[PDB]
Amino acid sequence: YLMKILHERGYGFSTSAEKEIVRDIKEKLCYIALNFDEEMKTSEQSSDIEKSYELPDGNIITVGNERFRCPEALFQPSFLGKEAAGIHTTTFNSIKKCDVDIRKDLYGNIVLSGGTTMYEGIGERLTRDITTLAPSTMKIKVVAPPERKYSVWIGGSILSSLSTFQQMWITKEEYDESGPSIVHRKC
Amino acid sequence: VQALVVDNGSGNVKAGVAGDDAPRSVFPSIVGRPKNPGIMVGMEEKDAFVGDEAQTKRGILTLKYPIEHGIVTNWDDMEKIWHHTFYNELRAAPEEHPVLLTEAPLNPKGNRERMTQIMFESFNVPAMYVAIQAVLSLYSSGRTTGIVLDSGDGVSHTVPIYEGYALPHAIMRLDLAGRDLTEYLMKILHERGYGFSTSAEKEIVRDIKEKLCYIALNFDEEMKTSEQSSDIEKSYELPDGNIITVGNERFRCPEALFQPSFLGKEAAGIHTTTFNSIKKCDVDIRKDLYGNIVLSGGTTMYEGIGERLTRDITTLAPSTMKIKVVAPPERKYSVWIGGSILSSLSTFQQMWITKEEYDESGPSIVHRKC
Amino acid sequence: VQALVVDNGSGNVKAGVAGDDAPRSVFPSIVGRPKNPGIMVGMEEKDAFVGDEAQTKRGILTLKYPIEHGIVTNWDDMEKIWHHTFYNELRAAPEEHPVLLTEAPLNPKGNRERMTQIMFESFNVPAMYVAIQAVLSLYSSGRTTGIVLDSGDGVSHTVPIYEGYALPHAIMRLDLAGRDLTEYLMKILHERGYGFSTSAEKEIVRDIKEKLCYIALNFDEEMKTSEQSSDIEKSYELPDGNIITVGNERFRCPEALFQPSFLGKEAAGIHTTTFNSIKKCDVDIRKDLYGNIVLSGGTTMYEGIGERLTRDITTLAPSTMKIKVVAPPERKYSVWIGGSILSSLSTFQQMWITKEEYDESGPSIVHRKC
Amino acid sequence: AVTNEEIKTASKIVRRVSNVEAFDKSGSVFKGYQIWTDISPTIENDPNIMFVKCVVQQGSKKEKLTVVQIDPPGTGTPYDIDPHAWNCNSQVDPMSFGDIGLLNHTNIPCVLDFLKHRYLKNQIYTTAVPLIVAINPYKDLGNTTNEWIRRYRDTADHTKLPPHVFTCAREALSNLHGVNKSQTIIVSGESGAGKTEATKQIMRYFASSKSGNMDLRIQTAIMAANPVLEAFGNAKTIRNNNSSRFGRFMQLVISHEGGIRYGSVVAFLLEKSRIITQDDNERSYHIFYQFLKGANSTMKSKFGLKGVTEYKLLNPNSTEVSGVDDVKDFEEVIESLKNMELSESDIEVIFSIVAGILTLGNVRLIEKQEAGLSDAAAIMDEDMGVFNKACELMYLDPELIKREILIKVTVAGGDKIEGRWNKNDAEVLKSSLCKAMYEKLFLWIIRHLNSRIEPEGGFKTFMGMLDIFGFEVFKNNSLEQLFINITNEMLQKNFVDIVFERESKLYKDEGISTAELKYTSNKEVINVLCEKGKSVLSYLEDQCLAPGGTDEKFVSSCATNLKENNKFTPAKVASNKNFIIQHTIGPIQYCAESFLLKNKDVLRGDLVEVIKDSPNPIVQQLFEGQVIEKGKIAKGSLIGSQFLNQLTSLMNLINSTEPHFIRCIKPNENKKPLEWCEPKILIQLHALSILEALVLRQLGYSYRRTFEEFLYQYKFVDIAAAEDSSVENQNKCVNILKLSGLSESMYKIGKSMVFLKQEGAKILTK
Ligand SMILES: C/C1=C\[C@H](C)C[C@H](C)OC(=O)C[C@H](c2ccc(O)cc2)NC(=O)[C@@H](Cc2c(Br)[nH]c3ccccc23)N(C)C(=O)[C@H](C)NC(=O)[C@@H](C)C1
Ligand SMILES: C/C1=C\[C@H](C)C[C@H](C)OC(=O)C[C@H](c2ccc(O)cc2)NC(=O)[C@@H](Cc2c(Br)[nH]c3ccccc23)N(C)C(=O)[C@H](C)NC(=O)[C@@H](C)C1
Ligand SMILES: C/C1=C\[C@H](C)C[C@H](C)OC(=O)C[C@H](c2ccc(O)cc2)NC(=O)[C@@H](Cc2c(Br)[nH]c3ccccc23)N(C)C(=O)[C@H](C)NC(=O)[C@@H](C)C1
Ligand SMILES: Nc1ncnc2c1ncn2[C@@H]1O[C@H](COP(=O)(O)OP(=O)(O)O)[C@@H](O)[C@H]1O
Ligand SMILES: Nc1ncnc2c1ncn2[C@@H]1O[C@H](COP(=O)(O)OP(=O)(O)O)[C@@H](O)[C@H]1O
Ligand SMILES: [Mg+2]
Ligand SMILES: [Mg+2]
């Protein structure tokens, strides 16, 4: 999607290495707005929303709206033409599919993870979107730790460094007995 | 009264008054400037030769096209081509008529803003809509549901439309067109023993590409049967009087459309960007999109592009669906003809961009009516 | 003269003029809005596609059903469906006829009050009774003593009636229906390797659920015999042309009706809510209620639901009584057919809610005639 | 008889405006006032009646009127009605005058009783002013012979004459030889309502003069060639076995010393889509059927003709009609062509063209899935002898006609490329070919009828006559009935033009400000139906050019763009198949099925030149003018566009002249004298806009009367003023008006007349 809006600005990235350059632009320049319509209307008057970037060619990229409409497709997926729901509505929609007692303990811990939650103000935008969707008597407390890119792997350390968990491996001889179907019995 | 339909093609401006079946003006997008000083006193200087006169005097001119991949790289040259088109070729004033320009999908915004800024400041046009070449070709196709793959000299679009609704998450453009095939044809003619380097030589290579290149059905089989040179070699006569003898270069000249790695590009072929644009649509409309693969543009005028395209997509598609390409005659003009049919409607006349509305909003209003 | 029988189903509006054997209009309760802007000038805009046209254009629409578990969640969508039903599909004016709406038991009061407020303020209906879907299915069943278990797309009722008298302390509803089985079928197809996420993909999952799912006789035996994949795998062709190969998902797709803990709900199965509704009745009428387990609704159109339901209830019931399910053909329409037979009576015409009576009491009169 | 669509439709026509008058004074007293009601068991038993004159019973309520049915004489049982009570003019003999504007109450049943009484007294005419009203007696009343021509022609005073055709036609010829301005008499009505009979009355009145009494062959030529225009031109609809689906328009040059010496017939707005498809109970144009049954074995053997059910242009289930012979009528067609002196070889070529059209309509097309395209238009195999026979009978090279049907060719910067047509567009080429050959055949033989009788220098000034239809009020309307209602909105706009012009200039001549007269704007309906760029017809041109055009997209596109005016309204039931237009006569519903089958007409000039290159000079005379275009005819070749050009030229021919109007109404459907049926007659009142013409008649200072006729008519109101003859007659009349309690806003003082509104006329007559 960032390649498509950069086709709108005047840059054409088509190959795979060009997609990786678009990934470096997406890491260094994209950030989630607090209110998207207000940032569009204030970004109609281009004051500070335009930034620069230097390529491995030495040119200059000047980005305008594409700092805050680049990650906005996570929250409004109809920019990508998908009939899905945003991260706030699939999260809150996953809260409403739980039972009605545990939700206080689930509105309280919205744990972020992965490298696509490394933007600016994803905790702020996510709390105001869920706080708009949730009942207003409950506080929404997102947990956005640093090193949330590695929160999978770090947990993979802590899980594999236990003594009870070592009763749960799938040994070589057990695969030699059951085949791969044993993995559907220990997951 | 009648609108004025101008196709700003990458290699052929095709313009004419609306309500016609064929353009009055089919002339290339060429600005040529003389590399040599004139010496005969009693002649026209004319520092910029524009249009077909620049091609009839091609031996003494530096010939430049202002359109690199659907994008104006030199606005003075494009303003000269529009000036020649309106005043010297169509012979109709811009103040008398509304103009209907056209545009590649995923064209940068500076072409629209600078384009309408030219057409309201330099030319005094009362009203003007700019449009997509592919949706106009689907007007002239006689349908409202299909996939247009355009291929001119700058672009190669694949715009799917299901029942009047565009799919802007599935428009896939491609920078493979007639100009890259002329350049690649020059490289393989360097392999045969002919050296074409200048601009007029590129136009001679374009005439060879029109008269001799054709798309093979299976490329490896035509290579192996063309190892034994029996009928694959042809002849051609130049404006010098010599003889060109082409061998493989009849069927590897347009094969770069389907295997772009000959050109060293990390892109996909026309069949894989078309089918790849089918897979980016939703899964109900694909039966109505595998059924109408509408060809367009002058780079689909080869032999057996319908046959090769149907066997490639039929290889890629699920085998239970029939692939029906629509390759009409006059598919070179299917943009412009649609530009007539669009501009000859009564609802469409509620959609122009008037002079006073540009005087209010500036060029940004064109990003609100497109 | 003749009444107008409208079944506001959760997934199929089934409406038609009274005194018939089958509805004229069987079309789904779908309001779809285009997610994409139109680009072909010379088309219909039509911001809300309602009914079967919304399903024939499913690839370009956000398709939303206004009925979540027998309850209208969006009254503008339901008013569009009623407007399409009366004017565009039945082609009969609401002023000409009385309308007979229907309603799932234990529906909140706001659906009745807002519903009759719509049908007297927006539509100008002279008279209207709203009714229970289960008692209408027992009219069409040809009996006056039995248990109706309804199962549509929002509800699953179990209304017992002994000789014309309702048992309102034994009406047990259940939120297991066709829509939860489509969602669960999407999850197990995520387990097989197919990803259906959008709304049109949910409708394709509904066609798979209709053509391929069937209720097993004993589920553990079919799991153990389906460990050795011999004949349990089937194929299906999409509107894309691919092939779906289903394995266990023919008999674990409707098994969530009988073991709701697959869906993670703390409810009871259809056999235990039915038998649990037998045990909430008094102890004399149960012989006449174990004898008539009347099925209804489109979620009882599976294979062997009579056989599995009789062996489950026969396991639960005392063994001296025979369990006789009544699974008629056209059990999808057993609501509407009963709505004909109820509205084609002479005593029932003393029970309408006239226009002037709504003009006196407001909507609260509907809570006095139900 | 009268049907339930006529009883229901006429019941919908019935409106209520003025309140019912029951009282004498402020006390609750009645005068034995006779009223009208629609609630009577006579109406519930006789469908020939919709209004019953009763008499208000004494001591009834104000909210509920106790009445006794007296007209018709039912029982003397007083029953109660909702004040469903209409006013009546009971004290007025309908044979005393002939102008419905002189009635005090101009509701619907006073007009039905006025025209009912005058028709049942065999007085079939009634001057609406400036209208005239003809009702068919289905016989001769004797007042049409040459002695009555001399009586209504030769008197020095003509306003003492009763209403007639001869009186209004006398006004037209008097305005012809008085001032050099062309007058045009517009005979409007249903085609069975005796428009041809009243037409022949105009033909004998124009024929007869003071010296040149029968010094003409023009009525002999046109009236002898009547079943040619009736042969090609009449088709059965659900209203007539002999309906007129176009307009005959005859421009006659009148001698001062004599009568007609020069003239012409030009038809206008000939419907073309009737040739291709018809309805169930509708025939095609009759010459197809009566040609398939009237020909001999030499003509059928030469033309290869078939049975009347074996032609797809022809409705296979409405060929048999009891009222039309279809065999011996064709001999009147042959002799009627011999009356304009056409040779039997040329007549044989004419019906060779007709047999070629009916042969061409059987030619089937197929889609070829193997071309450069998706599908290709191709002609079916066993229809090839049908096609070669079809071009042979039309004297055309069939290879070049097939070239024009299946192949398009254009030149784009010097590049003749041959595109292949689609099947449906080639069906539009074949259908457009049949319709164009038929209409230019028709106008060709009209040019032979005018070749006898024309003024060879042209028409400087003339005397026009327009046979024309009325409003198709009924439900199942289509593109043809839309064109009908559009033409009636044009003629209606001409009516408000000329009534506002006469009444405005007559306010000017008597010193009264014409600002108190108001133009009733037909501009909204003409803008919604006709204005190029924002009409219904412009968007029908769009759906002919929108490539995936359906009919639902048309009704919905007009629904979403013409919502700014209320004169378009989408219908409730089947909102994409039905749209309701607010015409001047009110809401008319239109069905939307098969619009694009009817409008799509592509007559490409590349084919027109191939037909002009025929070996037959007859076929060369068929297509005259009509230069090649070589581009899109898509802006102008549609039936909407051709309809706006022919309608533009016809309204140019009528608006340039000064008109006079004839309303023809037929009382029953059994063709019987003195049989009266208020529903069908009321539909003809609303269907010639006679009711709204009475609204325009009762608009403004309706009831004016001259000072001598006011002082004679209302002599007995103030006998002391009128018999004085020393005080001025103006002062006498306004003393009568101030005596009866009339404010000066209701009456204006003319120099020749007393000017009264309908309020002042009702307060004056108390
Ligand atoms: C950082 C990059 C480029 C440059 C150094 C960055 C600077 C910033 O670009 C310009 O200012 C030049 C101009 C441009 C022209 C007008 C304008 O109002 C703004 C920019 N843009 C162009 O010429 C387009 C031409 C084009 C091709 Br063909 N198809 C395309 C499809 C969509 C859009 C555009 C195009 N262009 C340079 C390219 O695509 C090339 C292939 N781009 C790249 O691979 C890399 C190196 C991206
Ligand atoms: C139709 C044309 C030429 C001729 C009449 C056509 C005939 C057919 O050529 C020959 O047979 C001659 C020969 C030749 C030599 C060996 C051989 O096994 C085949 C051909 N080729 C050459 O001498 C090259 C030399 C060359 C220059 Br420096 N750089 C180059 C870069 C790459 C390749 C080659 C070259 N050559 C003639 C040219 O480029 C000239 C400038 N060509 C032209 O502008 C036009 C007129 C093309
Ligand atoms: C009938 C359909 C698809 C095809 C024609 C049917 C055939 C049968 O699928 C394959 O065989 C391909 C493969 C597949 C891969 C491995 C395997 O052992 C079996 C199948 N499956 C995939 O690539 C997943 C990818 C996927 C996305 Br992203 N998220 C997902 C979430 C969960 C699961 C999977 C996914 N996939 C194709 C899709 O979701 C797409 C979007 N599916 C559809 O909308 C429609 C058209 C369903
Ligand atoms: N007969 C032909 N065979 C092969 N290629 C052709 C033929 N005619 C034209 N072309 C190529 O197609 C191109 C046409 O470009 P054009 O139709 O103008 O597209 P655009 O309008 O987008 O510029 C020409 O440059 C030419 O190279
Ligand atoms: N043949 C079938 N097999 C399985 N399920 C079916 C079948 N037909 C219909 N259904 C399911 O039944 C549902 C129809 O229920 P319906 O009768 O409409 O209930 P309601 O009238 O309450 O909406 C559909 O959603 C569909 O999923
Ligand atoms: Mg082009
Ligand atoms: Mg149901």
Residue numbers in the entry:
A (entry chain E): 189 to 375
B (entry chain A), C (entry chain C): 6 to 375
D (entry chain F): 2 to 84, 86 to 768
Paper's wording?
Actomyosin interactions are central to gliding motility. PfMyoA is a divergent myosin, sharing only 28.66% identity with non-muscle myosin IIc (NM2c).
Here, we report an atomic structure of the divergent Plasmodium falciparum actomyosin system determined by electron cryomicroscopy at the end of the powerstroke (Rigor state). Using likelihood-based reconstruction of helical specimens and a real-space modeling approach aided by molecular dynamics for the refinement of the model, we present a structure at a resolution of 3.8 Å. Actin-activated ATPase assays showed that the phosphomimetic mutation T417D located in the hypertrophic cardiomyopathy (HCM) loop of the PfMyoA heavy chain (at the TEDS site)23 resulted in a ~3-fold enhancement in actin binding affinity while Vmax is unchanged. This structure thus represents the Rigor state at the end of the powerstroke in which no nucleotide is bound to the motor domain and, like Rigor structures of other myosins, PfMyoA adopts an inner cleft closure in this state. The binding of PfMyoA to the PfAct1 filament does not induce major conformational changes in the actin filament or in the motor. Similar to other myosins PfMyoA interacts with the filament through five canonical structural elements. Despite the divergence in sequence of the actomyosin system found in the apicomplexan glideosome, the PfMyoA residues that are part of the interface define a conserved actin footprint.
